[PDB]
């Protein structure tokens, strides 16, 4: 039931995890379920089992010059993330410390969309998509077409709370500027070049208006970043025109 369980881990599960062979990394990994049931006294056992069951695979690829071994290193990464979830919940001060480190870890991995999806799958146990926004914006931006020219839209809609493909002609929402900007860039890289241009023009007008309400020693950094964004939008308006 490896594929049935794989489907279950996205957006049943309790039954699917009992039809997976135990003599493999994936069995212990997708019962370490234990981190989804908060069974830490079980998850610790499942993680140690996953480490022992993974084991030989690291030694098997020691003659492909560790090229294919990368996949096992990804499993090793993911296994630490399982422990990270335990520490995340058990020791609150680690939760913010982990945010630094996980991000630093993510930047060192390959840019394969599937590996990022697996990391995000486990990451969702501890961190909302609306907190590590840098990861989801980069995820959408990993490739001009991501892993399929549909995921960038779903991700941006998730971060927006607005679905412009159904809410047709809706104005650009009062959301974090990077999500709107990425959306407009995604519209440009399609047939809808004119719409992207006009939206960029109104986005710039909106930012110019918003800049006038962030003039203080408490929030001038926002205005400064908004100016950087204005510069990016103006260059895009130039090239698009």
């Amino acid at each position: 039931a490896r594929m049935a369980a794989a489907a279950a881990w996205g957006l049943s599960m309790e039954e699917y995890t009992c039809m997976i062979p135990r003599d493999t990394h994936d069995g212990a990994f997708y019962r370490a379920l234990a981190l989804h049931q908060d069974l830490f006294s079980l998850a610790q056992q499942c993680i140690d089992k996953a480490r022992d069951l993974l084991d030989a695979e690291l030694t098997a690829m020691a003659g492909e010059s560790y090229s294919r071994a990368y996949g096992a290193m990804v499993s090793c990464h993911m296994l630490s993330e399982l422990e990270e979830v335990i520490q995340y919940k058990l020791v609150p001060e680690r939760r913010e410390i982990i945010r630094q480190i996980w991000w630093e870890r993510l930047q060192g991995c390959q840019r394969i969309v599937e590996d990022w999806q697996k990391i995000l799958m486990v990451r969702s146990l501890v961190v909302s998509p609306h907190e590590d926004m840098r990861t989801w914006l980069k995820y959408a931006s990993l490739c001009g077409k991501s892993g399929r020219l549909a995921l960038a839209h779903k991700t941006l809609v998730l971060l927006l709370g607005v679905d412009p493909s159904r809410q047709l002609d809706h104005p650009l929402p009062t959301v974090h500027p990077q999500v709107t900007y990425a959306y407009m860039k995604n519209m440009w890289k399609s047939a809808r070049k004119i719409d992207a241009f006009q939206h960029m023009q109104h986005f710039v007008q909106t930012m110019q208006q918003q800049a006038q309400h962030a003039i203080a020693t408490e929030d001038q950094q926002h205005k400064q970043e908004l100016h950087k964004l204005m510069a990016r939008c103006f260059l895009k308006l130039g090239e698009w025109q």
Binding site: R51, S80, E104
Partner: protein, 675 residues
């Protein structure tokens, strides 16, 4: 090894039980084979023939333990000895019977193919007037049978009944047991909790399953004919194996066993009643003579196993044991330790009793008892709660601690300090114990401090008045003494104190970590695994305590640990370095680029996976490998003649060329010394 090699000779020439029993816990434990096989075997080959059970049973285990080695000498032993003990199964002799039982199984790839020749050899061997062979050697046929289940009985069964009481009986039992894996798994389950008498009894648990019942109806008649007094285990064993109406025979069995129930065949008798619960009313009745036994390790253990087999009668059994054991305890020091051990370990519903025996034990010179009693008294104190019990626990454990300070013998010292169990906190936290521990902490002998600090550390969360400033002093003074006093072997003991002085006293460690790590890392740099292993573990925990606050010292510490790890091929307890690096990086949040700044780390971790055989060490290496973010193979790479000659020249010239190259390759090596 020579010392034990010669002793093995004299031990087998042989009191005798003591020698063979003690050596049995070196045989197969030390792991040596150059002598354990190669000359020891001559002692077994010539000395074993005259050796009664149970001592010979231990020798039998030694036989199997030699076969397990599997080396050249082993192979010579296995064939030489079994081939002689196929014919000697010839009444001189008797050890040959047990050789077959174990040796045949130790190397099954050979013995599997000789099922019937062994039967023929028994057919002849049993003729000896002694009749020892007729019982033992025939029963030993399990050795030539059971291997068939790993890949004859369908006809040998009839041959056993027709061609072979003794013969047919002894062959029949094993031929039935081998019909399934269950025939022996049932016994393996049981052992979690004249020979023909025992075998006729053993037929009933197995003929019931082969052919379900005339066999059972006649088998019990044969039991009664072999006069009637017997260790009637048949119905218990059957009431596990099937329960094939075993009760129908009890009206002619229960009236025979019962007289033997008092401690006064007698080796079991208890086991002939227990298992029939699986007549609970009759076992309940009959516990009285069973619970009247004296303080023997065997009968007490049997009664405990009885309780485990029949939980619903446990209270009646345990109340008996409670009284039985307590009376001896209240009443000497050579037997009280069993009373105390089982009173503390068993599920009983036991305070002043310990104070009394403790006062007796403290004034005895029997060092074996001083060692056993210290930890055993600690076991019994478990249930404790009136103020009297509080004073009893604190007083007894304090007095054992005083022995742990004033007694020159390090083994008694160990036992009495080890006795200060975690379960007795809030009692050991009293001044009566902590003041004695204070004396231990400043004692002239470092072994006392080494043991005593762990207890003091634990107790730091309960009574800082007699812990905390002492731990502060010892951390500073011991870390100083490791260098300033010129300490030799004792330095390792002092190193052990470090970590013991840290793990359980966090209120000291945070503000002191700076002077500790600066000097502790200095000790890491000072030179000895006896020191470094403890320094490494302590630093690891210190990193866990401070987390990211000590990032400024990570480069120094990391480099030192890594260098220690790289030499793990010689310093083979440095799995510790793997753990320490793992916890250090995880705790501090060190930037995940040690594979760029110190690239060897990853090569080392991979070498561990394909060097070390210990699953734990490999698991830790995996944990460290996954601690850092998965590395893009590109960035990884960035951070880092026979055929060749053959086609370029005629063969007439090629031949000398490759000959000369091979010779010069050898000639440039140091191994040339031999060639």
């Amino acid at each position: 090894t020579r010392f034990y090699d010669q002793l093995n000779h004299h031990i087998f020439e042989l009191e005798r039980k003591g020698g063979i029993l003690a050596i049995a816990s070196l045989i197969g434990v030390e792991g040596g084979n150059a002598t354990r096989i190669g000359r020891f075997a001559n002692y077994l080959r010539n000395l074993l023939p005259s050796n009664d059970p149970v001592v010979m049973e231990m020798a039998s285990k030694a036989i199997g333990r030699l076969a397990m080695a599997g080396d050249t000498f082993t192979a010579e032993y296995v064939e030489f000895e079994v081939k002689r003990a196929l014919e000697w199964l010839e009444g001189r002799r008797h050890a040959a019977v047990l050789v077959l039982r174990e040796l045949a199984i130790s190397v099954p790839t050979f013995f599997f193919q000789q099922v019937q020749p062994f039967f023929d050899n028994i057919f002849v061997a049993v003729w000896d007037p002694k009749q020892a062979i007729r019982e033992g050697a025939v029963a030993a046929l399990r050795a030539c049978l059971i291997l068939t289940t790993q890949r004859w009985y369908r006809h040998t069964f009839e041959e056993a009944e027709k061609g072979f009481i003794h013969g047919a009986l002894l062959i029949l039992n094993e031929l039935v047991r081998i019909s399934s894996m269950e025939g022996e798994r049932l016994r393996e389950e049981m052992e979690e909790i004249s020979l023909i008498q025992m075998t006729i009894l053993n037929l009933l648990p197995r003929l019931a399953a082969f052919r379900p019942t005339q066999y059972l109806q006649d088998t019990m008649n044969h039991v009664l004919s072999c006069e009637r007094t017997a260790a009637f285990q048949a119905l218990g064993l059957l009431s596990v194996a099937v329960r094939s109406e075993f009760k129908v025979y009890l009206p002619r069995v229960l009236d025979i066993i019962r007289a033997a129930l008092p401690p006064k065949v007698d080796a079991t008798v208890f086991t002939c009643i227990s298992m029939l619960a699986r007549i609970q009313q009759d076992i309940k009745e009959l516990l009285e003579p069973m619970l009247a036994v004296g303080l023997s390790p065997a009968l007490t253990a049997v009664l405990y196993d009885l309780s485990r087999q029949i939980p619903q009668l446990k209270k009646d059994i345990q109340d008996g044991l409670l009284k039985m054991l307590s009376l001896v305890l209240m009443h000497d020091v050579g037997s009280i330790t069993l009373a105390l051990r089982t009173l503390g370990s068993f599920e009983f519903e036991l305070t002043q009793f310990v104070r009394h025996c403790a006062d007796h034990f403290l004034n005895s010179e029997h060092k074996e008892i001083r060692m056993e009693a210290a930890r055993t008294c600690s076991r019994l104190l478990t249930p404790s709660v009136s103020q009297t019990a509080v004073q009893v626990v604190a007083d007894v454990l304090s007095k054992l601690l005083v022995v742990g300070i004033t007694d020159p013998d390090p083994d008694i010292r160990y036992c009495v300090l080890a006795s200060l169990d975690e379960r007795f906190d809030a009692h050991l936290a009293q001044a009566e114990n902590l003041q004695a521990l204070f004396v231990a902490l400043n004692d002239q002998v470092f072994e006392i401090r080494e043991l005593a600090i762990c207890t003091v550390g634990r107790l730091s969360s309960m009574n800082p008045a007699f812990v905390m400033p002492f731990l502060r002093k010892m951390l500073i003074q011991i870390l100083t003494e490791l260098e300033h006093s010129g300490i030799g072997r004792i330095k390792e003991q002092s190193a052990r104190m470090l970590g013991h002085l840290v793990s359980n006293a966090p209120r000291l460690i945070r503000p002191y970590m700076e002077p500790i790590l600066k000097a502790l890392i200095l000790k890491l740099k000072d030179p000895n695994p006896g020191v470094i292993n403890n320094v490494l573990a302590t630093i690891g925990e210190l990193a866990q305590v401070s987390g990211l606050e000590m990032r400024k010292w990570v480069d120094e510490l990391f480099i030192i640990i890594m260098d220690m790890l790289q030499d793990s091929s010689l310093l083979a307890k440095r799995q510790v370095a793997l753990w320490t690096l793992g916890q250090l990086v995880a705790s501090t949040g060190y930037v995940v680029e040690p594979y760029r700044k110190y690239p060897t780390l990853l090569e080392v971790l991979l070498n561990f996976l394909k060097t070390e055989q210990n699953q734990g060490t490999r698991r830790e290496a995996i944990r460290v490998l996954g601690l850092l973010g998965a590395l893009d193979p590109y960035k990884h790479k960035v951070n880092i003649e026979m055929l060749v000659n053959m086609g370029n020249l005629p063969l007439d010239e090629f031949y000398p060329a490759v000959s000369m190259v091979a010779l010069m390759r050898i000639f440039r090596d140091q191994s040339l010394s031999h060639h």
